[PDB]
């Protein structure tokens, strides 16, 4: 679909706690994440294999993330990004390939976390209303207005390309929950893969680590 799903039924504007948010990573990074028991921000350490374009990642090291005066002084690279709609522009960049990675969607794994699980876990987080690197993007952690804060309607669409009258649609599709520091891996309750060999490899890794995780194979959440 859009990749905008929730844990109760379909996503609702007034119940952001049920939204499932998605973090994608290369399957070969998963043993390292297993070892640490958490997803780590880019600033923590360098990953087993990098999928992201290197100039994109260098930009995030200089992007101020500051919803409130109470929010820790921090960069985008200090956060783990979870895209609200799984089929997102950032995932397209990785899937089409570049100089640093060219594997396609095959080895990419989506780790889904419910926003309400992030909140209930007393983690520090905020939402961007679009492309986090852009200077006109805003961050917020006001739960009760998240529905109007992100472009909820666009995130639900199955078709979302830019048009002449709205060249900002892809950017708004990059709205994400940025979790400060790390995300304990037990908070992952959904795993999505593109193919069956990846899913088999993921389950052979995760069967001794955890249990109650829902596993799904969806070409539709990739490019």
Question: Is 171 or 198 the residue whose CB approaches other proteins more closely?
Answer: 171
Q: Which of residues 118-137 bind other proteins (CB under 8 A)?
A: 129, 131, 133-136
Residue 163 interacts with other proteins (CB under 8 A): yes or no: no
Q: Which of residues 49-108 bind other proteins (CB under 8 A)?
A: 53, 55-56, 58-59, 89-90, 92-93, 98
Asked whether 47 and 35 are in contact (CB, 8 A), the reply is no
| C-alpha to C-alpha distances, 19 to 14, 118, 131, 189, 215, nearest whole angstrom | 10, 11, 19, 12, 17
Residue 147 interacts with other proteins (CB under 8 A): yes or no: no
Q: How many residues does the chain have?
A: 223
Instruction: Tell me how many degrees the CA angle 121-210-22 measures, rounded to the nearest 5.
Output: 55
Question: Is 148 or 200 the residue whose CB approaches other proteins more closely?
Answer: 148
Query: Tokens 């956060």 label which residue?
Result: 79
Question: Is 92 or 180 the residue whose CB approaches other proteins more closely?
Answer: 92
Question: Is 74 or 198 the residue whose CB approaches other proteins more closely?
Answer: 74
**Binder among 73, 122, 165, 211 for other proteins (CB under 8 A):** 165
Residue 164 interacts with other proteins (CB under 8 A): yes or no: yes
**Binder among 86, 172, 185, 190 for other proteins (CB under 8 A):** 172
CA-closest candidate to residue 65, choices 143, 138, 142, 150: 138
Q: What minimum distance in Å lies between the beta carbon of 172 and other proteins? A: 7
Q: Is 26 helix (H, G, I), strand (E, B) or coil?
A: strand
Question: Is 166 or 197 the residue whose CB approaches other proteins more closely?
Answer: 166
Residues 6+ away with beta carbon under 8 Å from 134: 171
Please count the CA atoms within 13 angstroms of the CA of 156 that sit on its side-chain side.
10
Separation between Cα atoms, residue 9 and residue 146, nearest integer Å: 18
Q: What minimum distance in Å lies between the beta carbon of 170 and other proteins? A: 6
List of residues contacting other proteins (CB under 8 A): 53, 55-56, 58-59, 89-90, 92-93, 98, 129, 131, 133-136, 138, 151, 162, 164-168, 170-172
């Amino acid at each position: 679909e859009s990749g905008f799903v929730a844990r109760s039924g379909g996503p609702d504007r007034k119940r952001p706690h049920d939204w499932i948010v998605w973090h994608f990573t290369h399957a070969d990074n998963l043993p390292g994440i297993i070892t640490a028991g958490r997803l780590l921000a880019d600033s923590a350490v360098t990953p087993t294999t990098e999928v992201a374009y290197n100039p994109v990642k260098e930009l995030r090291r200089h992007k101020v993330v500051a919803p409130d005066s109470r929010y820790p002084a921090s960069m985008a690279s200090d956060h783990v990004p979870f895209y609200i709609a799984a089929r997102s522009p950032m995932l397209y960049v990785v899937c089409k390939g570049h100089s640093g990675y060219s594997g396609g969607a095959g080895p990419l794994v989506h780790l889904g976390v419910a926003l309400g699980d992030i909140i209930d876990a007393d983690l520090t987080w905020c939402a961007s209303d679009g492309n986090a690197a852009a200077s006109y993007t805003k961050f917020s952690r006001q739960v009760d207005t998240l529905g109007t804060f992100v472009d909820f309607d666009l995130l639900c669409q199955r078709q979302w390309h830019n048009t002449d009258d709205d060249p900002n649609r892809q950017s708004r599709r990059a709205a994400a929950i940025l979790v400060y520091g790390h995300v304990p891996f037990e908070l992952v309750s959904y795993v999505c893969c593109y193919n069956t060999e990846t899913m088999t490899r993921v389950r052979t890794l995760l069967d001794p680590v955890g249990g109650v995780r829902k596993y799904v194979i969806k070409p539709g959440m990739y490019y």
